[PDB]
Design a protein around this nucleic acid. Structure first.
Lengths: 99, 49, 50, 127, 150, 50, 127, 127, 127
RNA sequence: GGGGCGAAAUGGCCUAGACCAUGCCCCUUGGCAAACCCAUUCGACCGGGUUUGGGUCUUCUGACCUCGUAGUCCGCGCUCAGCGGACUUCGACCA
């Protein structure tokens, strides 16, 4: 398991950035929309597009970071490693005599 | 020594990979589920504008 | 799995919900970890006896 | 697979490896009915902070009975079960001569007539 | 720095106690690297109400100082002695060393390095274009509102 | 124009499970428990055009 | 290792043991491309309180396609996947003659022409 | 070390490697006085984001003068210095035939009589 | 590589090139323990505006000690370190006869008995 | 409680500018993996408590098992074990 430490790290410990994406979303792009629900029909003709153009731009700006994260994902499946070794010995006393 | 006979290697497997699962699952319960709940209502649209 | 975030830039009209891709990336990443599975392998190289 | 030959005096019994695993080795004796026979469980592990080791050896053998020889209808049914486990806690950095002397003492205590009487006549060891 | 008391009770020949106080300077990592700077293009024209194309970049980092102190004690074990408070009272025959310590901490030093995300963000062209268009629209709307009191 | 980048954090203390001795005895006395310090900061980069 | 020879009528296929383990035996056919070939999963266990046993046998074979013969770039890609699992629940204390009769009946039902028609023409079994 | 033989027509000159380094290879000609002789600097590198490469080749030769043959006392002194650098910007994913054709065209332009006249008589190239 | 044979009188020592580089040549003696042995650093460069040159030659040798012969645990540890550097500032346009005479004078001063006494008995040179 | 913000949602101010109101962003840390103990149908039944968890030699400095992290030359050969191997460094209950 100590051989997979760096791999697990670069896999998820850096992937938390991806989780950080949904945070800004839930925080701003759906909570700050409390104004659209309170305006009269005379303002929905504009607020809908005002929000759509702002969200599409954010998605477009998100796109490249997703590409970088995908490229980083491929970096984890590179078949590279080393070699392990061992050794074993044994002895057997044959004969002996005084002098 | 060459052509060693069939080896008897034993690997326990089950590395510490379940650890990262607790992170995504915990974070998913804090921002993803509320986002899906809010998006369930008034799912805005898009047009040529 | 060979999916891991579909990526693929795309844009349409009257069918693209802005915040529909946000949940998609996270769902794909979550489903990607459940499919992960190690697969180690070992083979004899060289030896000697003294 | 892995075969073990045991000499009882007039016949030779053969035990075959069935569940080859590192943390649990299960040997089964192949004579006739596989259910309710001779089984052996072996386990090897470490302890604490890489100090010593732990070896466990258990030997089970459940007797079976059958009535198909006289009675119309009775499947082979197990009767009692015997459990004889072990526990070996020998440190790595020890002494080969001391380990050999301990093994010889254990073999002598097993082959002595006092443990046989304690097992058969259920008389406490003390001769 | 730490100050400790080595109150050791003597044997039956007296049964007193010797404080023996000693100080011990201690090492610690460096203090937080505070930052505070300011820059601006050279003055072009004195007029500021109109002013000329300029720029300004300010960066600031700071950590509030806050000291705190910890402490702990302990002593040797004996055979069923019911007096093992900071300074053991009774004396059966042997001595008890005991010990009481109290070290202070400078929280300004026990802070990890600043993350790499603390940098200037990147803005594309479409971002600036949309942000300019929406701002101009809001300004024109605010202007239209003002003309309602003609 | 303008571009900002904020930063905020907190700090706490959590002593170890215990200070085990060899064959002696020890105990814990008075620890922070409450909050400790704080870190902040803010960057800015604005360019104005007529 | 372990080799299994299967006769299809005019050619002989060879399956080689790959993942030798007690609770999961994985045999893989060696002909050409190892990915998307013939695989066989075998498992043997017990049940309940040492009453009967459980044997599982699954055979999978996924077809592959390639365009390097005409198109100037396409790696071998798998198409569909077929799963054919089994389940054997035979108690230990049974009957050898009954087991042989059941095996013969299963072999006859497999070699009959009704199951072949059910597989090919997708017509329900009923002749 | 590394020797380079150049044929001028009637004699052969030998250049020896002196400063063996990856980012800077310095070859010096060994004939007599080492100071003020023939030197060659070679460099190889990449560019941008692993796209193409960059090769630099410079050849210098400074003439020397001496008065010890007639005048009492004058150490060998350098006169003028000539610098002839190069710049090769060839991408990796190119064409071997195109590179060979370009090398042949460069060799023909070097061996032609127009560049020789441009060098000697200082007449602009245009015949 | 590059081998250098040095005759001490009764035995021959061999130094092997380790770090082959133009601006720094590191020769190391191969006898037994590589750490704390005989090392030689050579460097050659220019100066000013291609006037003269600069040659540096340093020879180091650190003694080692070990207690594994009697004490039951002590790694080979270095004791003192000796540094003997040089500095050669000879211009290119010089005289071969003068350089040979200077080298002969240096060799005679090195082989004389006065420098040996100055090194051993630490007596100032003056006989 | 300790902080942040005027950004970001709007309202005063509202060439501009810098401050204000509701108002919005975080901490209340968390995890050990093993071994043993109770009353009883005189164990099946969930829940709790104790001993250990990178480890020893003088775990004082400093080293001896192990690895992790880097930088440097590296072998295209010399050594009985051989081998692919060398030197210097920081860390080592886990996020």
């Amino acid at each position: 398991p100590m051989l997979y430490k760096e791999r697990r790290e670069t896999l998820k410990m850096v992937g938390n950035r991806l989780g950080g994406l949904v945070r800004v979303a839930h925080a701003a792009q759906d909570r700050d929309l409390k104004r659209y629900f309170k305006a009269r029909r005379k303002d929905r003709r504009k607020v809908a597009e005002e929000v759509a153009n702002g969200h599409l731009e954010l998605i477009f700006g998100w796109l490249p970071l997703i590409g970088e994260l995908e490229g980083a994902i491929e970096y984890a499946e590179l078949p590279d490693l080393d070699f392990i070794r061992c050794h074993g010995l044994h002895t057997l006393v044959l004969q002996s005599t005084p002098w | 020594l060459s052509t060693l006979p069939d080896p008897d290697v034993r690997f326990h497997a089950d590395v510490g990979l379940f650890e990262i699962s607790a992170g995504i699952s915990l974070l998913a319960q804090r921002y993803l589920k509320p986002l899906q709940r809010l998006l369930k209502r008034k799912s805005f649209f898009y047009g040529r504008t | 799995d060979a999916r891991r975030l579909g990526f693929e830039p795309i844009s349409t009209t009257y069918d693209m919900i802005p915040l529909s891709f946000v949940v998609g990336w996270f769902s794909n990443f979550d489903k990607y970890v459940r499919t992960l599975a190690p697969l180690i392998g070992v083979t004899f190289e060289t030896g000697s006896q003294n | 697979s892995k075969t073990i030959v045991l000499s009882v005096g007039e016949a030779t019994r053969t035990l075959t490896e069935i569940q080859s695993t590192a943390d649990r080795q299960i040997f089964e004796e192949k004579v006739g009915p596989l259910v309710g026979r001779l089984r052996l469980t072996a386990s090897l592990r470490q302890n604490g902070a890489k100090t010593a080791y732990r070896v466990n050896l258990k030997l089970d053998q459940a007797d079976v009975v059958d009535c198909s020889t006289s009675v119309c209808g009775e499947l082979p049914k197990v009767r009692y079960t015997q459990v004889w486990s072990h526990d070996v806690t020998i440190v790595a950095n020890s002494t080969e001569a001391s380990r050999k002397s301990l093994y010889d003492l254990t073999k002598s205590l097993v082959a002595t007539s006092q443990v046989e009487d304690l097992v058969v006549n259920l008389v406490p060891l003390g001769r | 720095l730490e100050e400790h008391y080595y109150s050791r009770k003597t044997c039956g020949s007296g049964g007193g106690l010797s404080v023996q106080r000693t100080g011990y300077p201690q090492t610690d990592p460096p203090v937080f690297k505070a930052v505070n700077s300011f820059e601006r293009a050279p003055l072009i024209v004195g007029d500021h109400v109109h002013s000329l194309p300029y720029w300004s970049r300010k960066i600031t980092l700071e950590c509030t100082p806050y000291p705190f102190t910890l402490r702990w004690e302990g002593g040797v074990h004996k055979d069923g002695i019911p007096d093992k408070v900071p300074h053991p009272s009774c004396d059966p025959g042997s001595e008890l060393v005991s010990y009481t310590h109290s070290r202070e901490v400078d929280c300004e030093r026990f802070i990890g390095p600043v993350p790499s995300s603390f940098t200037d963000p990147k803005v594309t062209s479409a971002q600036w274009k949309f942000l300019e268009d929406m701002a101009d629209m809001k300004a024109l709307a605010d202007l239209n509102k003002s003309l309602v009191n003609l | 124009r303008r571009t900002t980048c904020e930063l905020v954090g907190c700090t706490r203390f959590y002593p170890r499970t215990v200070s085990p001795p060899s064959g002696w005895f020890a105990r814990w006395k008075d620890f922070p428990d409450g909050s400790l310090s704080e870190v902040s900061g803010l960057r800015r980069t604005d360019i104005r055009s007529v």
